[PDB]
């Protein structure tokens, strides 16, 4: 099934639970500007190859649009549009002065050399310069793009811009040497930890000494486990990856597991732990569960088998709506996917603020501001959850769409 249709259906289901005019819904069902450009680069053999680049700006009622750039061979305009629509609600739920945006290039970056990658980044900037800017559209790292590409892109934008303004703020996720921000490596995990702490506070559970299980041991999963163990004082008992998983009731040390992963290539056969698979790992009796891996892991097949009191969807939509209803029926508290992992876009917003102001913060200041933003967003969503007696995901959609609708009404875009 197409992704943009999925996003529009999600938006309509959200609008079912809130009072929104028909014209506003029709406005929100369409991206406000879609730009498709040709991105020509000259390769190492001397030939010129043309790639397809996208830049979708779904809505900018609340402010300049925000969103990453994907370099995937399976990129489509539908995927970019759906992700921009998703980014609108993501930045709206955590109360940022941002709209929704998304870019992408249909390219296999594995077959490109470093020089070709730099040429691709610079050519993409030259192609989409007319629709981006510090106050118009702020790109960011995404799938198969990294801070190196972000720095190349910022340099090209500054060259075109003739240094007439804050060219550092045109793009986020930059290296620290050029307008980069601290706390950009642990943003998602720190936001997830703050949301988990707030959820435990709401449920009355003290996390000191409790159990956590994490699926997926990449950046997000590893940092989530590490921050949970240190800040929340919890007992990490299970941490699986792409290959297999391990279990130890007394507690695992995420640093040692990461070292083992680096050495042997996986978290399999970890000493002192029992090797298990992802599916049973999802069903251990643990206080909180943090799926930080491939989407759609909790379905109707295993929804009733979840024994976790809190499920923090660190990954992008790892739970299906049927599993959502089943989990809610069990009383299991769910943190919606675009609320749990909203720390990354919040820290990107902080980086943009630092670049715009010309003044840069420390790690402690970024951490405290992230704490404030995530706590306030979670409490807003939870209060909507209780007041409307609807699902947590539905409450997050209600909050985001209500904010965007209010901004649209204030500008006079929609009269009703
Ligand atoms: O950066 P990064 O790529 O290392 O982090 P990442 O792209 O966010 O990947 C998340 C982690 O979970 C792994 N993973 C991929 N599919 C999974 C699945 N179906 N179930 C559980 N874990 C899965 C990933 O392994 P791989 O990225 O190696 O596939 C990675 O270790
Ligand atoms: N959330 C997307 C892009 C949003 C952003 O970082 O600005 C990501 O995982 O990078």
UniProtKB/Swiss-Prot annotation:
Enzyme Commission numbers on file: 1.4.1.3
Residue numbers binding NAD(+): 216-222
Alphabetical GO biological process terms: glutamate catabolic process
The family this protein is said to belong to: Belongs to the Glu/Leu/Phe/Val dehydrogenases family.
Residues of the active site: 102
Residues annotated as signal peptide: none
Keyword Heme in annotation: no
Keyword NADP: yes
Keyword vocabulary terms for this entry: NAD, NADP, Oxidoreductase
Catalyzed reactions: L-glutamate + NAD(+) + H2O = 2-oxoglutarate + NH4(+) + NADH + H(+); L-glutamate + NADP(+) + H2O = 2-oxoglutarate + NH4(+) + NADPH + H(+)
Name of the protein in its database record: Glutamate dehydrogenase
Pfam hit, one: ELFV_dehydrog_N
Parts of the chain that traverse the membrane: none
Quaternary structure and partners: Homohexamer.
EC category name: oxidoreductase
Example of a GO MF term: glutamate dehydrogenase (NADP+) activity
């Amino acid at each position: 099934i197409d992704p943009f249709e999925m996003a529009v259906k999600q938006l309509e289901r959200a609008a079912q639970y809130m009072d929104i005019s028909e014209e506003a819904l029709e406005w929100l069902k369409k991206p406000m500007r879609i730009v498709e450009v040709s991105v020509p680069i000259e390769m190492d053999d001397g030939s010129v190859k043309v790639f397809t680049g996208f830049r979708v700006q779904h809505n900018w009622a609340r402010g300049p649009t925000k969103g990453g750039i994907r370099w995937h061979p399976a990129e489509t305009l539908s995927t970019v549009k759906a992700l921009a629509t998703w980014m609108t609600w993501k930045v709206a739920v955590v109360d940022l002065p941002y709209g929704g945006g998304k870019g992408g290039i249909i390219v296999n970056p594995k077959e490109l050399s470093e020089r070709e990658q730099e040429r691709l980044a610079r050519a993409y900037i030259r192609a989409v310069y007319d629709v981006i800017g510090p106050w118009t559209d702020i790109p960011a790292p995404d799938v198969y793009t990294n801070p190196k590409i972000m720095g190349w892109m910022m340099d090209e934008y500054e060259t075109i811009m003739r240094r007439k303004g804050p060219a550092f703020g045109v793009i986020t996720g930059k290296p620290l040497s050029i307008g980069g921000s601290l706390g950009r490596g642990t943003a998602t995990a720190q936001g997830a930890i703050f949301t988990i702490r707030e959820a435990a506070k709401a449920l009355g559970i003290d996390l000191k000494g409790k159990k956590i299980a994490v699926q997926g041991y990449g950046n997000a999963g590893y940092y989530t486990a590490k921050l949970a163990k240190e800040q929340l004082g919890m007992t990490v008992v299970a941490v699986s990856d792409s290959r297999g998983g391990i279990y130890n009731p007394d507690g695992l040390d995420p640093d040692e597991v990461l070292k083992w992963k680096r050495e042997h290539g996986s978290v399999k056969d970890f000493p002192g732990a029992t090797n298990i698979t992802n599916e049973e790992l999802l069903e251990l009796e643990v206080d909180v569960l943090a799926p930080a891996a491939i989407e759609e892991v909790i379905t109707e097949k295993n929804a009733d088998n979840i024994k976790a009191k809190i499920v923090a969807e660190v990954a992008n939509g790892p739970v299906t709506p049927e599993a959502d209803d089943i989990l809610r029926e069990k009383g299991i508290l769910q943190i919606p996917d675009f609320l749990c992992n909203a720390g990354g876009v919040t820290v990107s917003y902080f980086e943009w603020v630092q670049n715009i102001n010309g003044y840069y913060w420390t790690e402690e200041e970024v951490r405290e501001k992230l704490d404030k933003k995530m706590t306030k967003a979670f409490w807003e969503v939870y209060n909507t959850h209780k007041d409307k007696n609807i699902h947590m995901r539905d409450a997050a959609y209600v909050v985001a769409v209500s904010r965007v609708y209010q901004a649209m009404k204030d500008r006079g875009w929609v009269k009703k």
